[PDB]
C-alpha cells in the first residue's frame, strides 16, 4: 500500500488523492478540519490513540467538543492564526489529556491542498 511518511513535504497533496480506506492506512493520526475546526475526516490511527470512534467524531468540533485540551494558544491559537493567514505548517509536541489518558504526542498542522480544509497529524512520542 502507500505508506506516507509523517512530515512529507507534499503530505496534503497525497492525502487529497486518497481513495476509500487509504487514510486509515496511515501509521499516524490524521484529522481533517474546516475553518472552524469541525472534523471532516478522522482516521483509525488517531482513534487508536484517543479511544474515539472515528465515525462519531465527524461533524463535531475538534477544539470545543472532542479535544478541549487543545483549546489553548499553543494549539488552537496557532490553528486560528494559520487559518486567518492562509498559511499553516507547524510542528510542536503536545500533551493530550482532559478527555483521555495524558499522552505526549508530536503534532503537525498544515493547510490542505485545495479547498478550505486543514490537517492535524498526530503520533505518540
Ligand X SMILES: *C(=O)/C=C/c1ccc(O)cc1
Q: Can residue 109 be called a binding residue for ligand X (CB under 6 A)?
A: no
By CB under 6 A, what part of segment 35-64 binds ligand X? 46, 50, 52
Q: Can residue 66 be called a binding residue for ligand X (CB under 6 A)?
A: yes
If phi > 0 it is left, if psi is from -120 to 50 it is alpha, else beta; for residue 43 that is beta
Which span (1-9, 19-27, 90-98, 107-115) binds ligand X, by CB under 6 A? Answer: 90-98
Choosing from 99, 106, 113, 117, the residue that interacts with ligand X (CB under 6 A) is 99
Choosing from 60, 68, 113, 117, the residue that interacts with ligand X (CB under 6 A) is 68
Q: Grid coordinates standing for 108?
A: 503537525
- Backbone CA torsion sign across 26, 121, 82, 9: negative
HSE toward the beta carbon, residue 9, CA cutoff 13 A: 0
SS3 77: helix
User: Given the rule CB under 6 A, which residues bind ligand X?
Assistant: 31, 46, 50, 52, 66-70, 96-100
Amino acid at each position: 500500500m502507500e505508506h506516507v511518511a509523517f512530515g512529507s513535504e507534499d503530505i496534503e497533496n497525497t492525502l487529497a488523492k486518497m481513495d476509500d480506506g487509504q487514510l486509515d492506512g496511515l501509521a499516524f493520526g490524521a484529522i481533517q478540519l474546516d475553518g472552524d475546526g469541525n472534523i471532516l475526516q478522522y482516521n483509525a490511527a488517531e482513534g487508536d490513540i484517543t479511544g474515539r470512534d472515528p465515525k462519531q467524531v465527524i461533524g463535531k468540533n475538534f477544539f470545543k467538543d472532542v479535544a478541549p485540551c487543545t483549546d489553548s494558544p499553543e494549539f488552537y491559537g496557532k490553528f486560528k492564526e494559520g487559518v486567518a493567514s492562509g498559511n499553516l505548517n507547524t510542528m510542536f509536541e503536545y500533551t493530550f489529556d482532559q478527555q483521555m489518558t495524558p499522552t505526549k504526542v508530536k503534532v503537525h498542522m498544515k493547510k490542505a491542498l485545495s479547498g478550505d480544509s486543514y490537517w492535524v497529524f498526530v503520533k505518540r512520542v
